[PDB]
Design a protein around this ligand. Structure first.
Ligand SMILES: Nc1ncnc2c1ncn2[C@@H]1O[C@H](COP(=O)(O)OP(=O)(O)OP(=O)(O)O)[C@@H](O)[C@H]1O
Ligand SMILES: Nc1ncnc2c1ncn2[C@@H]1O[C@H](COP(=O)(O)OP(=O)(O)OP(=O)(O)O)[C@@H](O)[C@H]1O
Ligand SMILES: [Mg+2]
Ligand SMILES: [Mg+2]
Lengths: 743, 58
């Protein structure tokens, strides 16, 4: 019953939008049985409610072709109601509708152009002659005729707003024509249906802001005081301001908007006076809603504040929100993406006591957001918004809008060959062919990245699983450890075992740890955050802990996310080993890291991968159960793994057939992957030297080397060296033995 | 507040949110806060127990 207020009950007034076969602007048709169920007569005036607080008036008609559950409308009254096909609207008998004494109309500016004669005489007068048409203020209606059919807006009605246009009624088009852009903006108005992925949040908001203002008697009688302070908090782009616009458009209560920094004024005492004026004007027009966007701009913690005017403003806000109880129906809703920066006293009982977390949407929520954003675009048939919803692992809704915009921009780019930018006009066929396809959405997904991971983004080489040679068990284990927790958490819950959320890679240098991280970044469908070791450390006291907090928080915001710690031993070194030497900031850093590893719930899919070639100096606490549980030894490759590495490196290279990779694997017993890569690079450089010298010789004689050969590899092998010694290997062997003994 | 407090012998004053008008002078960043704290101190000291004014704080 959490989202019961969202779903609309089946009512006799509730009817599905249907196309009207022959109804004009001022009439609608309903099925006769449903009409009798509604107790309505033919020729009766009817009031149609619509989305975004828009209503229309028509005449009910009986049509057998019309469905019982459907009400038939033409497109004009659909635009008057801001509704479309498939929508549900409520129809009621409009009582005591009177013949209009006088009605003033304003035609649209585009339609009047090219019409030499009078708009009234040619269009309005024959339209309303003996028509007895019901009209409402603000409605837009189209009259056919002349060179071009002309649209009109009924700006003024008498009596207002409902009136019947009798012949004696005077309709006149004098005045300023209404811009088409104004009508477009009015129709394209943000409503509750423009919000996706926040069904529970919308439920809470409707329960807190719309229900008390519509029906305060219920809250009075049940015995409770309706909530007064509501605070929307969440990551940037999640839709707090969107929710505020939807509420402002779809609420009958007076809406007052306070932009935070706009409170300040140069005159002494004018800022808190502006706050007072806002609350007083809300009280004058009650029921009222006061929206404060960027609440942290004017409401920081008073203890941290070094300005007297800012502290006085926080105190004024506290006083006004306390006195809000005396105010009859004023409700204060605030939005901020830094809820922790808000003054704590403002979050107490009686003031901003309700908090709504506009979080990151899930797959279905992202699908709803994509459906909302793509409703106006001209999608092709091949598009599949479900796939796009599944790909965008860390998108919040602004990112999805960016994705749709980029897909449409790619669609427009595909026609830049046919249309030049310097061209003055475009053929209509080019517009007719223009459409967004699934390839454009796939290009957008390739370019798309979460907005949160815009500072941690790094250029990663295109490493693929087939680029890595050997390590097949490690590859399979990593693929499972990434896919299983996100895809099937229900099995882990059923068996009662939480998936491992921490992996450490340890091994000799050059054996494939960072390469595995690159492959994970390129291949897995999870957001990847790669940070260098000492990237977080800062000289200013308290900043390194804040950096750890920020990186872990933006890892959570992009879940499922992989947080890779290259050279972990810089980030996490043994506590007490260097405690005496230094200020002690590294110990605070590692303690903060431990706190963040412990703080994660299993529901957030933030996989933490650490890489180090010195596991012996890793802090013992980091490896304890619950944090970096899975410890993986990336070893020195063996003969089959060396064959795989040599094939993977030479996969894109022209290599002679007689070049035997098996013997190279045999002879390079102690070599690592980096050593084999160095051998191949040295052979490539020898081939390049031979080709360059051959070209120089040919130029000299005037005034080759199709592929790498066996002699090139033979020459490169004598320069080859084993990078990792036996003692180094023994070090990881002792680490593994001690770790097994501990476990 | 204090003056129409002493004007009535059995009068009483209640200061809700004392920390707001009385922050610790050791850690405060404004002149007006220190002035208001010290002014409250002087008002408290001005009482000679003959006014019989009782001041509670929260
Ligand atoms: N749930 C959603 N459904 C539909 N569109 C959404 C949703 N969330 C965000 N958007 C779109 O993304 C943008 C969100 O901007 P908005 O001002 O609402 O965000 P915000 O939460 O106030 O962010 P910030 O904290 O940066 O102020 C808008 O263009 C809006 O159309
Ligand atoms: N299994 C492998 N298959 C293919 N190439 C490999 C493999 N292992 C290592 N290499 C190559 O050898 C080099 C090893 O670099 P890599 O980033 O993998 O090392 P690392 O294990 O992270 O070591 P370090 O401790 O020195 O940072 C790279 O050039 C990489 O392309
Ligand atoms: Mg906003
Ligand atoms: Mg490395």
């Amino acid at each position: 019953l959490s989202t019961a207020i969202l779903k609309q009950k089946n009512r006799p007034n509730r009817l599905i939008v249907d196309e009207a076969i022959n109804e004009d602007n001022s009439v609608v048709s309903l099925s006769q049985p449903k009409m009798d169920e509604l107790q309505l007569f033919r020729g009766d005036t009817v009031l149609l409610k619509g989305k975004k607080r828009r209503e229309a008036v028509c005449i009910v008609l009986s049509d057998d072709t019309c469905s019982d559950e459907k009400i038939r409308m033409n497109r004009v009254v659909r635009n008057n109601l801001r509704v479309r096909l498939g929508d549900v609207i409520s129809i009621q008998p409009c009582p005591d509708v009177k013949y209009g004494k006088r009605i003033h109309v304003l035609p649209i500016d585009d339609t009047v152009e090219g019409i030499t004669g009078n708009l009234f005489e040619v269009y309005l007068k024959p339209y309303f002659l003996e028509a007895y048409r019901p009209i409402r203020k603000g409605d837009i209606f189209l009259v056919r005729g002349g060179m071009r059919a002309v649209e009109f807006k009924v700006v003024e009605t008498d009596p207002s707003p409902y009136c019947i246009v009798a012949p004696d009624t005077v309709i006149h088009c004098e005045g300023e024509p209404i811009k088409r852009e104004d009508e477009e903006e009015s129709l394209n108005e943000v409503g509750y249906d423009d919000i996706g992925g926040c069904r529970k949040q919308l439920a809470q908001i409707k329960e807190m802001v719309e229900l008390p203002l519509r029906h305060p008697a219920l809250f009075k009688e049940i015995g409770v005081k309706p909530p007064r302070g509501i605070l929307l908090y969440g990551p940037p782009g999640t839709g707090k301001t969107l929710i505020a616009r939807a509420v402002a458009n779809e609420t009958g209560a007076f809406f007052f908007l306070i932009n935070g920094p706009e409170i300040m004024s140069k005159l002494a005492g004018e800022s808190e006076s502006n706050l007072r004026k806002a609350f007083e004007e809300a009280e004058k027009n009650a029921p009222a809603i006061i929206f404060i966007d960027e609440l942290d701009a004017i409401a920081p913690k008073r203890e941290k504040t070094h300005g007297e005017v800012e502290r006085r403003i926080v105190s004024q806000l506290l006083t006004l929100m306390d006195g809000l109880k005396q105010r009859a129906h004023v409700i204060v809703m605030a939005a901020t993406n830094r809820p922790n920066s808000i003054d704590p006293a403002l979050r107490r009982f009686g003031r901003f006591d309700r908090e709504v977390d506009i979080g990151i949407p899930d797959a279905t929520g992202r699908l709803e957001i994509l459906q909302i954003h793509t409703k106006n675009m001209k999608l092709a048939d091949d598009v599949d918004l479900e796939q796009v919803a599944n790909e965008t692992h860390g998108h919040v809704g602004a990112d999805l809008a960016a994705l749709c915009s980029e897909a449409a921009l790619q669609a427009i780019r595909k026609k830049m060959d046919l249309i030049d930018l310097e061209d003055e006009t475009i053929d209509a066929e080019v517009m007719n062919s223009l459409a967004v396809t699934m390839d454009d959405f796939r290009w957008a997904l390739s370019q798309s990245n979460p907005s949160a991971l815009r500072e941690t983004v790094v250029e990663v080489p295109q490493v693929t699983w087939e680029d890595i040679g050997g390590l097949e068990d490690v590859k399979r284990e990593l693929q499972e450890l990434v896919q299983y927790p996100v895809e099937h958490p229900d099995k882990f819950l059923k068996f009662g075992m939480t998936p491992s959320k921490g992996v450490l890679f340890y091994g000799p240098p050059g054996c494939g740890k960072t390469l595995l991280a690159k492959a994970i970044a390129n291949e897995c469908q999870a957001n990847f955050i790669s940070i260098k070791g000492p990237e977080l450390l800062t000289m200013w006291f308290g900043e390194s802990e804040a950096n750890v907090r920020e990186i872990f928080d933006k890892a959570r915001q992009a879940a499922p996310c992989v947080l890779f710690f290259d050279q972990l031993d810089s980030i996490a070194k043994a506590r007490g080993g260097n405690i005496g030497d230094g200020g002690g900031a590294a110990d605070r850093v590692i303690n903060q890291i431990l706190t963040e590893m412990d703080g994660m719930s299993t529901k957030k899919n933030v996989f933490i991968i650490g890489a180090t070639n010195r596991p012996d100096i890793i802090d013992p606490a980091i490896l304890r159960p619950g944090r970096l549980d899975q410890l993986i030894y990336i070893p020195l490759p063996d003969e089959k793994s060396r064959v795989a590495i040599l094939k993977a490196n030479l996969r894109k290279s022209p290599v002679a057939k007689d070049v035997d990779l098996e013997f190279l694997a045999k002879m390079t017993n102690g070599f690592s992957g980096a050593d084999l890569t160095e051998i191949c690079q040295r052979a490539c450089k020898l081939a390049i030297r031979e080709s360059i010298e051959s070209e120089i010789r040919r130029e000299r004689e005037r005034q080759p080397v199709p592929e790498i050969r066996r002699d090139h590899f033979e020459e490169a092998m004598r320069f080859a060296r084993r990078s990792v010694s036996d003692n180094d290997i023994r070090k990881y062997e002792m680490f593994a033995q001690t770790l097994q003994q501990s476990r």
